[PDB]
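Ticket 4471: requesting a sanity check on a complex prediction with BXL. Repro inputs:
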Amino acid sequence: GRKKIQITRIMDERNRQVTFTKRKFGLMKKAYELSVLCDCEIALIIFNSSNKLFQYASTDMDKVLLKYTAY
Amino acid sequence: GRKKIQITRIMDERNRQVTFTKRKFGLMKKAYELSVLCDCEIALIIFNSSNKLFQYASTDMDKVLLKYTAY
DNA sequence: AAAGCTATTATTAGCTT
DNA sequence: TAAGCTAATAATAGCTT
Ligand SMILES: Nc1ccccc1NC(=O)CCC/C=C/CC(=O)Nc1ccccc1
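Returned structure tokens:
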């Protein structure tokens, strides 16, 4: 980025929503790439600060989860 | 990297294990940064191709999950 | 070997219209 | 404004020892 930042909670709800949308995309993109490159099951559940749910899974969520609990 | 790659399953078990260890770290690092920067609950469950489990959660893994199912 | 290096591609923080 | 740009930081693929 234009400037290095420090990893601490962004206080401005506006920049926080924006950063959240950029980085959520970035996080799902890498999760997907890791699933394909290395052949693994992955599940990513994300609730933003307003409690809205976002999710990614390399297959049906319900399966990754049960494999976790059965583990 | 030294060369751009294409997103497809790595056929060599050796390079696949190596890429998996590098990128898993990279994926958890971004998940963590997103949790802190934007104040959200996150859960990431990963099973490699040999079925070993790896996981990250911004709180107890089982709390994020219950919040998902209760959702 | 396998732990680390670096040239290179990828992501992104702040800015711009 | 908010959609997109780009200067700059970050991650990593292949190499190095
Ligand atoms: N079908 C499906 C298709 C596409 C995307 C997602 C889904 N899947 C769901 O929409 C619901 C997931 C159900 C979860 C099954 C296992 C489980 O319930 N695991 C658990 C729950 C609470 C606490 C701990 C562990």
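Notes from triage: Chain B touches chain A through 37 residues (CB under 8 Å). Leaving this open until the requester confirms.
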